Amino acid sequence: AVKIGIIGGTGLDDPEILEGRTEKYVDTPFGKPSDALILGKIKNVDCVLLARHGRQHTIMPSKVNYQANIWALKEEGCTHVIVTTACGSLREEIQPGDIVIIDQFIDRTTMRPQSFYDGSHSCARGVCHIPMAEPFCPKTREVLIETAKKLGLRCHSKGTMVTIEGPRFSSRAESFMFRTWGADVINMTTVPEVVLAKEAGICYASIAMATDYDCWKEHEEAVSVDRVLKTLKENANKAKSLLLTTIPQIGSTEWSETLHNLKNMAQFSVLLP
Amino acid sequence: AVKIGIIGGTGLDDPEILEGRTEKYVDTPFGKPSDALILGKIKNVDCVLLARHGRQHTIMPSKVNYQANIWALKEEGCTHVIVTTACGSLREEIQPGDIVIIDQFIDRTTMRPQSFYDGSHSCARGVCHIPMAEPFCPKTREVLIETAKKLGLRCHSKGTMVTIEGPRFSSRAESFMFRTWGADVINMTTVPEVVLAKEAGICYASIAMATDYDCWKEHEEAVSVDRVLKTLKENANKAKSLLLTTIPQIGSTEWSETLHNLKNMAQFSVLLP
Amino acid sequence: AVKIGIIGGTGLDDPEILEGRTEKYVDTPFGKPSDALILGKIKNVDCVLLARHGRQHTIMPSKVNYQANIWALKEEGCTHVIVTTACGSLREEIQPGDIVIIDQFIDRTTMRPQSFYDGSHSCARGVCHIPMAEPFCPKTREVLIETAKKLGLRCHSKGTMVTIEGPRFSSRAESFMFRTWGADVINMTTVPEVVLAKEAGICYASIAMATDYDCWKEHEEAVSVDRVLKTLKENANKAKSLLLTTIPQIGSTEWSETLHNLKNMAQFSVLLP
């Protein structure tokens, strides 16, 4: 069965869009999810919705309960998780408003749990070393790409997200260094969400929306909260249209082989006594 | 009004120099400052002095209470914070003994709180994402530069500090990598001091004194505590003269616009419910 | 006297090999070592054996008690610590099965104590800033090199280990970035083991065994637990032969000057009140 966890800036909740809406507060072995899971049906496909920074944004990216979020989506039975994220563009040709279907990351985070297998829980015994060669679901990305071209939206079919610890924005020196590293976009939340998704055997893809060019331009104002907020307001419909047209397609594709493979990868990543 | 917090290796305390000296032990929402604040007047300008690693240097750079230090200077009413720091040179042309008026950093730290807005305190509610495009006060740096040329001291008008976690020094591989990154000087304390200063709406500049060339030279002894200590002893007067001649000038400049701008930046960085 | 702590994948325990075997559970100021120290004699040289991830591998590289391991070896009286480690090759010419006698590292770790001098213990008072220009014992490496050529084994006489936090493997973007950085091999345990060894005045060298090429190859399967495990099984005898032929030689060399120098370096790294 297809069940799609959706994380992020999605006005997808709900009434016209979400049929059979149910609000469910969840307690996981890793503590509390960011907010109540919102459960329902979007065009006859089972979905689960989750606001990353909580009821009206009160928790910093560093202190987001990533373990609880992923574990709670898996336990509802999600086979997919498709997320949305604001990001800074590190390249001229990724303009604010553009979607980037990222395919790689570089971790610049420092204070974040990145495994369920942390020694502390009976649900996750042993040590897990999960492969990250292909951090993002190949077939989901493809649908995301096909669908954005169907929508005639500006879109980059690939890209490397650098995830900074934050909550501060980058210095200029840092911005230029990530440029030399070959990173395309920058955020605060992609790691460890994607790593925990893979540990859980979930197919996970990210819709990244560029909102600013960070601070690397010498003659333009550098990123701020207010500039990200207004760009994000202007452009939020694109990520929303992309998901409404994507979700029909996911629920009408063959998935058993991808999910079987993802399950074995996660299974065989773990070392028991 | 002008009030200048001064952090670091400053024999500025006191008797000839500091008029109207007062020792004040402070308790902030973020715990204890590194040491008692020493309060007084240097050439008719209100100053506040603070030893970064405590009464006779007992705390590692990683465990320095950066939140408490900055918050306590702000609460005394500082409009400026000008700091001094030892550093390793990552370029031949920055010789030991040289001052670098840094203008950028690269964060290599890992275990450090970098925001007052951490979820825990009523004085700092919401999430703060502070811009870091220009981490250091433009007009203060300028005075620092003008004044060092007035002193005929060797000086670099700009520079990128890499801040390592420590307390160890860098491996050679690490030293060469920061070189390829375009870093000029290296230390253990610049981040998060500067980031917390900006969150507080304080104009903050750093006097960086090169003490060694780290370990990148193939045919010279690599950095050690004793080599830094003796270079620092030989060269400590330069940073002291620079501040005595700088402090008159700060207290005689126009500041209201810079501080208004810095206040709005900090104000508009924060997200409430 | 020579006493050699040996950490890692060593079937050196024991009966044919280890004379006068004794199992000793130890309590250090920094908590418990990874496992019981196994104590005895290998070709008439006093050795101490220690399994890094514990009795049948149950602790993640991030949560390994590095402070306890090193401190317990020092307190038994080790003058040397020679370790073995699996690693990913970041260069074509380092083939799986090859030994790399590493000589440098780059730290990509984030959540790890890296000093005994942490403020908390009477055995380690003050702040320690240990030089890392030459993180690995020069004369031990040399014996390791000479001995591998005597064994006619494939061997790289130098190399830069990047130590990632883990427990996940690297993304591809990350793999390529460490390549551009000039790293040769990749692991999860080298830092802070080597840094704590130096703080302790112990001569410390690493036998690194390449087990995989991580994920940088476009047309080969990326690293997994099972691929590392089988390569490691196939190649484990090489690291074992290298140590049996190395250990005679260490116990028959002049060491007093190296250890005196290493002791002064550690001594003079520390700042008391």
Ligand SMILES: Nc1ncnc2c(CN3C[C@H](CSc4ccc(Cl)cc4)[C@@H](O)C3)c[nH]c12
């Ligand atoms: N240059 C940049 N650097 C790092 N991250 C970002 C991001 C990504 N997030 C924006 C956000 C800061 S602004 C914002 C916007 C809406 C709301 Cl409700 C709350 C806050 C952080 O979660 C990271 C966009 N541009 C970035």
Ligand SMILES: Nc1ncnc2c(CN3C[C@H](CSc4ccc(Cl)cc4)[C@@H](O)C3)c[nH]c12
């Ligand atoms: N190559 C290098 N790398 C990192 N940091 C530094 C530093 C900066 N600090 C020196 C200092 C180590 S030596 C010292 C000197 C005086 C006293 Cl009272 C106490 C200790 C650390 O706080 C970082 C200088 N050279 C450096």
Ligand SMILES: Nc1ncnc2c(CN3C[C@H](CSc4ccc(Cl)cc4)[C@@H](O)C3)c[nH]c12
């Ligand atoms: N590409 C790579 N990246 C990071 N580390 C490694 C390592 C080094 N270790 C292997 C090991 C993962 S696989 C393994 C093997 C035997 C046992 Cl008993 C338990 C687990 C981690 O400790 C890091 C090899 N290849 C690596």
